[PDB]
Amino acid sequence: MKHTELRAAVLDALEKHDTGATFFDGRPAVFDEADFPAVAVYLTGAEYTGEELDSDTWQAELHIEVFLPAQVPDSELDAWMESRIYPVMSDIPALSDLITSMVASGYDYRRDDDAGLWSSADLTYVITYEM
Amino acid sequence: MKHTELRAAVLDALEKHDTGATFFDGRPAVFDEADFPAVAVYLTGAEYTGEELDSDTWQAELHIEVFLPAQVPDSELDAWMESRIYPVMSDIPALSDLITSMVASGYDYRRDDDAGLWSSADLTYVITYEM
Amino acid sequence: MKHTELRAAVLDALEKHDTGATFFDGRPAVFDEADFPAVAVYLTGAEYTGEELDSDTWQAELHIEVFLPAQVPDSELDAWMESRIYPVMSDIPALSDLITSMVASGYDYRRDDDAGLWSSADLTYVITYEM
Amino acid sequence: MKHTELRAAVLDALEKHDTGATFFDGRPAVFDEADFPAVAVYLTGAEYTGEELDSDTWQAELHIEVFLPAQVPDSELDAWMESRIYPVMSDIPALSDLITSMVASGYDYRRDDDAGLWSSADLTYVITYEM
Amino acid sequence: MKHTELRAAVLDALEKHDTGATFFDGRPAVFDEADFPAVAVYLTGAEYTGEELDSDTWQAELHIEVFLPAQVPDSELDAWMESRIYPVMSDIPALSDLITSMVASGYDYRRDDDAGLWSSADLTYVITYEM
Amino acid sequence: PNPTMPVKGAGTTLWVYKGSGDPYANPLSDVDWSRLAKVKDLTPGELTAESYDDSYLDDEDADWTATGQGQKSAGDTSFTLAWMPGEQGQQALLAWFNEGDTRAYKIRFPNGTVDVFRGWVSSIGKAVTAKEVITRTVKVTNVGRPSMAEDRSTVTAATGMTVTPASTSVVKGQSTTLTVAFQPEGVTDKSFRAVSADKTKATVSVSGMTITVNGVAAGKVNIPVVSGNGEFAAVAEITVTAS
Amino acid sequence: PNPTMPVKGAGTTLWVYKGSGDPYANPLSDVDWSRLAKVKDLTPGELTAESYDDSYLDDEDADWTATGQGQKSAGDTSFTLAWMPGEQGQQALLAWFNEGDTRAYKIRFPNGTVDVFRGWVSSIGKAVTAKEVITRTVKVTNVGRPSMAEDRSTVTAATGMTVTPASTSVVKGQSTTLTVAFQPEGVTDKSFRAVSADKTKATVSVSGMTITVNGVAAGKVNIPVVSGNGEFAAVAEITVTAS
Amino acid sequence: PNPTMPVKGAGTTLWVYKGSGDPYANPLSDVDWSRLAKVKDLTPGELTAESYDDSYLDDEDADWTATGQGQKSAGDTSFTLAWMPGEQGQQALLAWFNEGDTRAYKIRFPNGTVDVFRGWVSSIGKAVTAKEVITRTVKVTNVGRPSMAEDRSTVTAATGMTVTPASTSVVKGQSTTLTVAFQPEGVTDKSFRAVSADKTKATVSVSGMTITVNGVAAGKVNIPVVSGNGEFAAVAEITVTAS
């Protein structure tokens, strides 16, 4: 197992800097309109790209989600997703030992339309890991 | 056919290890909120990739599926999957005799979105077998 | 961070020219029928095509969007994109120093149908930048 | 740019022969059962195929449509297309200098199903133009 | 185009054979429970795959639909398609002189699901012609 | 861990002999072998035999070519692996290339079998791009007669073919199980064949050495079960009954 | 930057030697290497070693192909990069190709591990289409022994550059000798550079693990020191006196 | 429009010299150059060379092959353009090919530079098919040393670089911008890095011609700045304060 270890390691790497946000691990989330801007960490995929003759060498997708209230301008989302979260995770020594390689993939936004309650920005990482 | 014992074979392996879950076999399932976390085994695909001039050598997808209550965090599913299944399905003597090759594909997560009674962790295997 | 600089640079060049339009930058917009024809500029994509061994060199798509009321003939809209925006981005020294390279990709049309309040035309520019 | 005159030139090139149809330019249309069978001209696409290293040489798609009421047999649509529109536009010197190269694509039918308020035949051209 | 002539030719070829069915040309149709088992002939596609530097050489598709009451077993459809349509059009001099090449494309069934008022069998050909 | 079944193939290991004794002696021993970690891909050197001409002027019609096997070549073995400069041993193999000596390496398959080659390194390269790890490319010129794992494999057979006798009650489909066991330690090269002497009153439906003898018509018959080897056989007494 | 772990490849940089000494002595320091950036892609030179026959009719069974490696060669290295006509260094290689000497170049991986090859430019190409930045492709054939990374394999470094501050006044031709040394107990590929920050009153002529400061006129100025590739620095103030 | 940054490529122009004097004089002016239009593509003649050998018996080393750059050729340039018989100049090009003389042609890139080569026509192709315009294909075999764009470039350097002194007011990370510009005409070949002499009280954070120094712990710091040439350098006195 690495997913619990991986998710734990990255959130700690984020929390070392100044706070200002909630750090919902896992997936069930459940926010309510008081625990706002917060960050979620989870994984998807987890296939069996063989790629090797000595270990399974699976790959997965690491998602970093930051949620902001409704219709705030994306400017802070750009600042949040580029400055708050990107440079800090750029080199986490715990992950380097934990994983085999880390690659950045995605940088997206998603505005709630029905009732327009929230606004989410997605940072996607592709992870090659062996478990 | 091979499927019945195939489903029987894996069921023996997991039941042989420590329990902690019901083992509704096949697909009809029907749980109600009494028989929670439990697993199921079934097959999908079953096509006729020839691949061999003397034997039909069919192949199909194998699903090991485990359901967990509603919004339990993935960590339990992650722990459940990479401890109670993946190590167990590493090698089974019965399976080797029954089928030709055993290959892993991947595993994902999904859950009841509306209402939200259940969470599901699905592991998908690939089996090549001869009639 | 470059998006705020990038967004500001282009809009200011647009604002530098003749007025006659609101310059809502970013995303949330929210018009009502008092601040009509207005221009919206935003970014999408921003993946990690590596393509370069010494720097990440991402690339994202730049949108230039302008809204017109309902059944205004497209001739005005065709005039509007020429009369207002398209020639201006032919040479803007501001973002040229800011980003690596940027080309045009397309120029489309769309409109509301149910209640037909709005009608819009979008400009898509593929931009290549390092951050 | 040239979109206004290009539609203007071709619609004028159509009007030289007998009348008996509206020549709605662009898109807004709005027919009602009083200005019936008519034609509409508009363009879509407008990409930036390079194809050339001296000038933009943009390429778009030319849409020419005709609308007929309810379930009039397509024989009228065929006859209308093969005579009223297709031959005349096949050589219009007015746009010869206005464009770079013209090529036909196809000819399709699509008619109202609910209440059958109309019936439309669409002729589609691909246009390469130096905007 | 020559569509009216071609449809007339194939329709007359069908009508020459022993009748018993309505022979709707075009597409308005409108059956009611009195013109049952019947046929309709129409054309779709109509592209400009030029393919030849001497003439347009357009290519279209021929639909021959046959409609039968509700949920008649498909044996009747098989008999209809094998007796009254497929062989009879295998050699018709009128269309032979009208077009360049005619090729069998496909043949399939589909019956109404909601209220099941009809069951149709479609025979589709591909034709190359010059306009 | 049997060699008699098709193997998945994933999980094989690569080793290079480093001692001084004969690698062909105990290829199973890994004591004098260095494991090569992180093998991305492997490509064994194929075994090829040159075609030697044999046609002569004075013979019958030479309408068909007459060529015999000529000199045999062990080919070239290539593989790719993750670039690990800090690993101890990658320096050795490139130095092995640098010194240009002939050494021996073995491949341990995820089956219980190992094959060993002899040769010298010929091609070393590295491929580098973004969003993928740096890969090391190796190609080795195999030399001499190499040791196929088939030679290491042994043979178990003979001692005859045992059979379960009697089972002379055949009626209503029946398909009585019949086990033609093989005497030597169970483990044997099973090449047998069972077939009834009548083909109508009694028949055989052998499946996995478990013969199922069925019948419809009555009478008396003896079912012979023979070995593909041609010298060992068994015959069982069968009296099928209609009802 | 661990060399014993797999590494992606991002951040790799290419350098061309520009000094007048052996490149292989201090590959880690980039003082005598000029860097070229905006490298689109890189294909490292591939080490080759052709076969050499070793056969005799008076040998054993001639059913195999006993051969050894002969002329090992590093092949050629090719890469592409964005065209930079108005950038210093593009002309250097262009001129380097134009007269075709045999210079050396260095590739630096994101691991502190570098390699050095000497060769001459074999081919220069320019690729240009619409919508795509002009790229220039260059092929250089390696010559001689390639100084590959794994040979060193034993780098050591730490933090600190010792030097003697003050020593302000100096007479009799000035020329005060100031000692400079490394903290990591000398076990390091040492390299440093120091010059006069003003040169108006003092002149520094660093030579052989130490510097000499011969002031041309009275006055105070600081003397910058850069520890080779640019990781540590020190400043010594010099107030040369007129007498 | 600078040559010191990568440029797209769209907007490139092709010209053919039609005058009489040497085209290499002022290729920037298009006085005697025939301009072509609607050029579908372009493929510059890549510069190529040969691997001349210098082997000898009396050699200490043999294994590593040694070769030198031989003679260099300009290759062939080919391009396609819309078939324009009515254009004036394609006939001249056709006449050029038919007469088979050696002529000079230049390319003006949308970058601010020009490149001209001398050669003779080698191939003329015409592609005809519906749904897209007829294309005329041309290939020219270059001859001799070609005039290269970078040769026309000019370089400004030396005279040192400036530095903002003092900047001693340090508090809460300092974040004080330091400008290191060059006195000579402003424009030069930029190669300079700042390396702190303490790395503890103050640390350099070089950022695109701007130095944003920082302060953590109180102290007196002499921050040195140096240039790529290794000749010009300066030291800035910093009084870092923790609070």
Curated annotation (Swiss-Prot), chains A, B, C, D, E:
Assembly and partners?
Answer: Homohexamer. May bind to major tail protein V, and /or tape measure protein.
Give GO cellular component annotations, separated by semicolons: host cell cytoplasm; virus tail
Record localization: Virion; Host cytoplasm
What is this protein's function per UniProt? Plays an essential role in tail assembly by capping the rapidly polymerizing tail once it has reached its requisite length and serving as the interaction surface for the completion protein.
Does the record bear Metal-binding in its keywords? no
Cross-referenced InterPro entries, in alphabetical order? GpU-like_sf, Phage_lambda_GpU-like, Phage_tail_protein-like_sf
Task: Return the protein name.
Answer: Tail tube terminator protein
SUPFAM superfamilies according to UniProt: Phage tail protein-like
Its GO biological process terms?
A: symbiont genome ejection through host cell envelope, long flexible tail mechanism; viral tail assembly
Q: What is the similarity comment for this entry?
A: Belongs to the lambda-like tail terminator protein family.
Its keywords, alphabetically, are: Host cytoplasm, Late protein, Viral genome ejection through host cell envelope, Viral long flexible tail ejection system, Viral penetration into host cytoplasm, Viral release from host cell, Viral tail assembly, Viral tail protein, Virion, Virus entry into host cell
Swiss-Prot record, chains F, G, H:
Location(s) in or outside the cell: Virion; Host cytoplasm
Q: Name one GO cellular component term.
A: virus tail, tube
Q: Which domain of life is it from?
A: Viruses
Could you list the residue ranges that cross the membrane? none
Residues in domain BIG2? 158-236
Every copy of the Big-1 domain together lies at 201-243
What the entry lists under InterPro entries is as follows: Big_2, Phage_TTP_N
**Principal subcellular localisation of the protein:** virion
One GO term under biological process is: symbiont genome ejection through host cell envelope, long flexible tail mechanism
Mind listing the UniProt keywords for this protein, alphabetically?
Host cytoplasm, Viral genome ejection through host cell envelope, Viral long flexible tail ejection system, Viral penetration into host cytoplasm, Viral release from host cell, Viral tail assembly, Viral tail protein, Viral tail tube protein, Virion, Virus entry into host cell
Q: Quote the function comment for this protein.
A: Forms the phage's tail tube composed of 32 hexameric disks. When it encounters the appropriate initiation complex gpM and gpL, it assembles in hexameric rings that stack on top of each others. Multimerization ceases when the correct tail length is achieved through a mechanism dependent on tail terminator protein.
Subunit structure of this entry?
Multimerizes into a structure formed by 32 hexameric rings stacked on phage baseplate gpM and gpL. Does not multimerize in solution without the tail initiation complex. Soluble major tail protein interacts with tail assembly protein GT during tail assembly.
Q: What is this protein called?
A: Tail tube protein
